């Protein structure tokens, strides 16, 4: 009989994993402060990693990798890419980004303006976007003056990166979108890509001559269901799944989702996770970690894929909670605590 504790009541993913674990009749849930657990569904913030692996006779496992925030923070991700030789500053699948601290607080202000002035002089498209992790708070502008002044009005670190002016637009609708991929890394640092993704589409026609209205530029499910008037028109909940998206790419572009987009996504996922593996691996640690990641990608009209951000505590698509949450138990929990297919994941092999 295995034991687990829950320390994030707001996690829809692990609320289901906890619901599944109990259904097996071989897992018991303890009070969130009981230290004699085999598995911890930990809190998002300030997870007490230093208290794990010190219980005699208990192999303990946790659903977060200590240090993975380096990848899941807007500013951290930029710093990680620019400073890591494995990714280099010339990394071709990440938009040109800069870390900008508000003047009321290193900082890449002058470096950003230099590249900005270059684009302005060369007649090139000079539209940038400013954002931060402390947002629900985004601004898209072609003037550097507006981007910098908007950050000073705030009090947290921000990131200015190039806005993809030439996105791939689905038809009919002429509408933007992003691709969410769920990636599960187990205690052995195997990288499993959930075979099911989601396109979070914008129900509004893309408009490049008006960044003031951010409903056709931001593909967030919350923004589309609140400020968009065509929500649910083309696909249910502004969510197109891989089957429909692949069929579209075949009818429209005479290509496949695997060939045109998926190879780049798998390559990006591998690069990011292999880069921080020496820093967060629990191979020789007194406890073990696994974690579910939410990768967000943009696709341009050239079928080139761009990494937007990585989410460390992602939610899932309603239709895919059962399959994925089961998969989490199969490869992440039961692999360490076995119970008394055709996998739903895609193992991204690599060199440890």
């Amino acid at each position: 009989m295995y034991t687990f504790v829950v320390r994030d009541e707001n996690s829809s993913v692990y609320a289901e994993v906890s619901r599944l674990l109990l259904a097996t009749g071989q897992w018991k849930r303890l009070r969130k402060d009981n230290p004699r657990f085999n598995l911890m569904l930990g809190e998002r913030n300030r997870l007490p990693f230093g208290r794990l692996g010190h219980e005699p006779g208990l192999v303990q496992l946790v659903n977060y990798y200590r240090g993975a925030d380096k990848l899941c923070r807007k500013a951290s991700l930029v710093k990680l890419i620019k400073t890591s030789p494995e990714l280099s500053e010339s990394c071709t699948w990440f938009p040109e980004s800069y870390v900008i601290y508000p003047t009321n607080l290193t900082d890449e202000r002058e470096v950003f303006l230099a590249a900005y002035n270059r684009r302005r002089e060369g007649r090139e498209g000079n539209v940038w976007i400013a954002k931060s992790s402390a947002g629900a708070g985004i601004l898209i502008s072609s003037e550097a003056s507006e981007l910098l002044d908007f950050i000073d009005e705030q009090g947290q670190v921000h990131v200015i990166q190039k806005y993809l002016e030439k996105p791939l637009l689905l038809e009919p609708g002429h509408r933007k979108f992003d691709i969410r991929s769920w990636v599960l890394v187990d205690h052995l640092y195997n990288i499993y890509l959930y075979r099911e993704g989601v396109l979070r589409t914008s129900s509004e026609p893309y408009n490049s001559a008006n960044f003031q209205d951010k409903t056709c530029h931001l593909t967030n499910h919350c923004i589309q269901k609140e400020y968009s008037k065509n929500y649910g028109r083309y696909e249910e909940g502004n969510e197109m799944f891989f089957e429909e998206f692949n069929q579209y790419l075949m009818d429209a572009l005479n290509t496949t989702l695997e060939n045109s987009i998926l190879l780049q996504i798998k390559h990006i996922i591998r690069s990011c996770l292999m880069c921080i593996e020496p820093a967060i691996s629990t191979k020789h640690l007194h406890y073990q970690s696994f974690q579910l990641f939410g990768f967000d990608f943009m696709v341009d009209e050239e079928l080139k894929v761009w990494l937007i951000e990585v989410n460390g505590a992602p939610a899932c698509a309603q239709k895919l909670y059962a399959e994925l949450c089961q998969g989490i138990v199969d490869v992440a929990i039961s692999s360490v605590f076995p119970l008394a297919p055709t996998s739903i994941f895609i193992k991204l092999h690599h060199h440890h």
């Binding site: 007490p48 230093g50 208290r51 010190h54 200590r66 240090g67 967060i280 020789h284």
Partner: protein, 438 residues
């Protein structure tokens, strides 16, 4: 030459001290009767080993050590053991009943009645020194004597030897080899009152020593003898510079200078390698790079923690055996390109390296295999704060209910000393976070 006086308090300190001086003798060629043939200066001399051994006219080499325990059964082992001849009776101090795992009982009730005696015996040793450096104090956190009486001894030592350094070797409590539930209480009480009196403390978590013995030595259920022989190898590595000719950590002050930029943050992390089982058919000898790389594996740290998520303030590499600087620098270069080694910005990113050509000595019939080279890394990481958090958390669980507090109040301690000590640890945890986190 400057002398060092070792003080062993409580069962853990005394039995660890027994293992160290055993090793010290084998290292310096001193027989159990105190005779040292290689010492061509009979009855005197200011050699490096004289920092730990005095000499009699009859050629005996006597440790500059004091053994203190509120109960006599452990020290009676020394009096009748193999090295009974090394020490004279004045060096072994024992009471009739112990502190019962109660800090207040060791510090106040019993300590008050024996403190002056211990200082008198230490004064006798100090009078044999022409230039005393300071003291090395071995003890446990969890014992009532190790915790309670040590803190009282540290306070008085600071009064009677203000200008002398004091280093600690402290045994952090581990439930796998502990039967006292109140050890978190004692650990925090003794850290609070000792903090301002110790210049450098090497914590050894029994949980780490225990797992190293099961994992590397294939001891299914390690004993105190197994744990203590491994511990004295590390202690030997740390004190070898005081007992042998060299230029690194040649006096007690150099430990603080090299490892403790901030006084309160004086708890270096110790890492040792290689630990090889003697029962092995025969082991492939590890290289300088391999044993150095092993210094950044949690599995061989004296305290289980993750230095990858802290910041280093200092780092010493202490090699023993077949090691030339060339191979050291090569290994270090490789380890930087692969390991997560972040230093605080106000400190240089470097390593002080010490090499002693005499490979580690192993007690005949012990559990450790003779290796051609070994290394002990002393690094000051904020990651060792994890150990304070674990300990402070256990303190909070029991103290929220005032569990067992009546035992301490009954010995004359005020309840406020509990919270006073706890708040000091909270400040210690905050200091580590300010230094290591962004």
């Amino acid at each position: 030459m400057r002398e060092c006086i070792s003080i062993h308090v409580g069962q853990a300190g005394v039995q660890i001290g027994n293992a160290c001086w055993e090793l010290y003798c084998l290292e310096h060629g001193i027989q159990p009767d105190g005779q040292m043939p290689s010492d061509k200066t009979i009855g005197g001399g200011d050699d490096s080993f004289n920092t730990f051994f005095s000499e009699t006219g009859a050629g005996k080499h006597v440790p500059r050590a004091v053994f203190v325990d509120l109960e006599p059964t452990v020290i009676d082992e020394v009096r009748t053991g193999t090295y009974r001849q090394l020490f004279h009776p004045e060096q072994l101090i024992t009471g009739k009943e112990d502190a019962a795992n109660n800090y207040a009982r060791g510090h106040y009730t019993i300590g008050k009645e024996i403190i002056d005696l211990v200082l008198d015996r230490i004064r006798k040793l100090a009078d044999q020194c022409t230039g005393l450096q300071g003291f090395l104090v071995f003890h446990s956190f969890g014992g009532g004597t190790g915790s309670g009486f040590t803190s009282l001894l540290m306070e008085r030592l600071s009064v009677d030897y203000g200008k002398k350094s004091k280093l600690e070797f402290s045994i952090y409590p581990a439930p796998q080899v502990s039967t006292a539930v109140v050890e978190p209480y004692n650990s925090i009480l003794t850290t609070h009152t000792t903090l301002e009196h110790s210049d450098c403390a090497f914590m050894v978590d029994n949980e780490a020593i225990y797992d190293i013995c099961r994992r590397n030595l294939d001891i299914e259920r390690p004993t105190y003898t197994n744990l203590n022989r491994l511990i004295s190898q590390i202690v030997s590595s740390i004190t070898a510079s005081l007992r042998f000719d060299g230029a690194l950590n040649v006096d007690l002050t150099e430990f603080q200078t090299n490892l403790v930029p901030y006084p309160r943050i004086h708890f270096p992390l110790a890492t040792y390698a290689p630990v090889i089982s003697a029962e092995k058919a025969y082991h492939e000898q590890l290289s300088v790079a391999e044993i150095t790389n092993a210094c950044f594996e949690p599995a061989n740290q004296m305290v289980k923690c993750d230095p990858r998520h802290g910041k280093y303030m200092a780092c010493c590499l202490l090699y023993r055996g077949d090691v030339v600087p060339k191979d050291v620098n090569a290994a270090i270069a490789t380890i930087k390109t692969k390991r997560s080694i972040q230093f605080v910005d106000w400190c240089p990113t470097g390593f002080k390296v010490g090499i002693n050509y005499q490979p580690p000595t192993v007690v005949p019939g012990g559990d450790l295999a003779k290796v051609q080279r070994a290394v002990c890394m002393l690094s000051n990481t904020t990651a060792i704060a994890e150990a304070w958090a674990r300990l402070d958390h256990k303190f909070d669980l029991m103290y929220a209910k005032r569990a067992f507090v009546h035992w301490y109040v009954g010995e004359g301690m005020e309840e406020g000393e509990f919270s006073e000590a706890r708040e000091d640890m909270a400040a210690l945890e905050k200091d580590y976070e300010e230094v290591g986190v962004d």
